[PDB]
Amino acid sequence: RKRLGDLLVEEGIVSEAQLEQALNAQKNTGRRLGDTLISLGFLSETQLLNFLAQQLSLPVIDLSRAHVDIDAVPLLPEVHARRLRALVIGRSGDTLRIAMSDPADLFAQEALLNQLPDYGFEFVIAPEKQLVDGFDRYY
Amino acid sequence: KLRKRLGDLLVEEGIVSEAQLEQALNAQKNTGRRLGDTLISLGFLSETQLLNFLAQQLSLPVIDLSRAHVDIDAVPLLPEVHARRLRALVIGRSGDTLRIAMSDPADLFAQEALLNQLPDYGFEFVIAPEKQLVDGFDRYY
Ligand SMILES: Nc1nc2c(ncn2[C@@H]2O[C@@H]3COP(=O)(O)O[C@H]4[C@@H](O)[C@H](n5cnc6c(=O)[nH]c(N)nc65)O[C@@H]4COP(=O)(O)O[C@H]3[C@H]2O)c(=O)[nH]1
Ligand SMILES: Nc1nc2c(ncn2[C@@H]2O[C@@H]3COP(=O)(O)O[C@H]4[C@@H](O)[C@H](n5cnc6c(=O)[nH]c(N)nc65)O[C@@H]4COP(=O)(O)O[C@H]3[C@H]2O)c(=O)[nH]1
């Protein structure tokens, strides 16, 4: 997979110098690169969501207007959903549609496999704020 | 799971050669040593290179902990004896999320321990050199 900074440069969203500044800043915080670029004023939140979706080849969703399957939600117990920042929003056959705010999180991906074994997975990316509101709404 | 396995990553990015990888895989068997450390022992890879490519493999950043922002109030959430055992330092807290620097974020045995030790906090992981972690323990406890 292409790295996010390189993607944003190739797409003309940030310059090489801006990317280097953010990478240097990140070495001193450990915050995510996209979040760092937003702090520096070089990237917007909407761009971050859209370009993450492009990097990972996942759809963006507006959960605030989505119609969530309320019988799919409980397949992932609340304690795990909140911890992993993941919400099961649909079930077709044995494929679950799962919204995540950090779908690039390797350890969350590993955990989800452990918590929801034997299902097919389709992922969509949502803003963390919408996920958090979703947990309150659907549990 | 699934990360790209480390050998293939290092070969594809032109860090180690195919024959060297095969040599290290052969040599690693039943030594108790992981692949990166085997490659380093054979002189094909450096500690810094291993750090940087583990970070790429695990999709996390390397930090310079000697200069990094550390919430010195967040540090004590993990008692010193556990921080030292697990080679893990809590450097940020916000809501129920902790940012944790580890020398080995691939250490799942340590991760399990960290999880049971800091329950009801979720984690964001970053990697730092072990020397910097230990200096951090001396500095923040
Ligand atoms: N939800 C969310 N996801 C985000 C954000 N920023 C980055 N990501 C996604 O999450 C992964 C980890 O980001 P990171 O912690 O900044 O960790 C990054 C970062 O430290 C660094 N990195 C990212 N892009 C570049 C680059 O163009 N050049 C270099 N040298 N390093 C890069 O390598 C690590 C892995 O990069 P990736 O493969 O791109 O993988 C990224 C990316 O897929 C964010 O603000 N929010
Ligand atoms: N802190 C630290 N972490 C390390 C080091 N070396 C590897 N790791 C990480 O820890 C996991 C286990 O390494 P392993 O015991 O060598 O066990 C490895 C190794 O025996 C083997 N492996 C790795 N790469 C290759 C490869 O390219 N070809 C083959 N045939 N086997 C491979 O598969 C197992 C799993 O590989 P991975 O998915 O890459 O998962 C690796 C990797 O993420 C190290 O020196 N220090």
Author numbering:
A (entry chain B): 7 to 145
B (entry chain A): 5 to 145
The study reports:
Recently, MshE (locus tag VC0405), an ATPase associated with the mannose-sensitive haemagglutinin type IV pilus (T4P) formation in Vibrio cholerae, as well as its homologue PA14_29490, an ATPase involved in the bacterial type II secretion system (T2SS) in Pseudomonas aeruginosa, were shown to be potent c-di-GMP-binding proteins. In both proteins, c-di-GMP binding has been localized to their N-terminal T2SSE_N (hereafter, MshEN) domains, whereas their C-terminal ATPase domains were shown to bind ATP but not c-di-GMP5. To explore the possibility that MshE contains a special kind of c-di-GMP-binding motif, we have solved the crystal structure of its MshEN domain (VcMshEN) in complex with c-di-GMP to a nearly-atomic level resolution of 1.37 Å. The structure revealed two 24-residue motifs linked together by 5 non-conserved residues that work cooperatively to form a 53-residue domain that binds a complete c-di-GMP molecule.
The VcMshEN structure was well-refined, and its macromolecular chain could be traced from residue Lys5 to Tyr145 without any interruption. Each MshEN structure could be further divided into two subdomains, a four-helix MshEN_N (α1−α4) and an α/β MshEN_C (a β1−β3 antiparallel β-sheet surrounded by three helices). C-di-GMP was bound mainly in the MshEN_N subdomain, with the only contribution from the MshEN_C subdomain coming from Asp108, which interacts with the amino group of the second guanine (Gua2) base of c-di-GMP. In VcMshEN, the N-terminal α1 helix is broken since the full α1 helix causes significant steric clash against c-di-GMP (cyan arrow). In addition, α2 helix in VcMshEN is extended by two turns and swings downward to enhance interaction with c-di-GMP (blue arrow). The backbone amide protons of the third Gly residue and the following non-conserved residue in the motif form two hydrogen bonds (H-bonds) with the O6 and N7 atoms of Gua1 via its Hoogsteen edge. Each of the two conserved Gln residues (Gln32 and Gln61) in the motif forms two H-bonds with the ribose 3'-OH and phosphate oxygen atom. Therefore the unique interactions of c-di-GMP with MshEN seem to be driven mainly by the three highly conserved hydrophobic Leu residues that form a triangular cluster to hold each guanine base via extensive CH-π bond interactions.
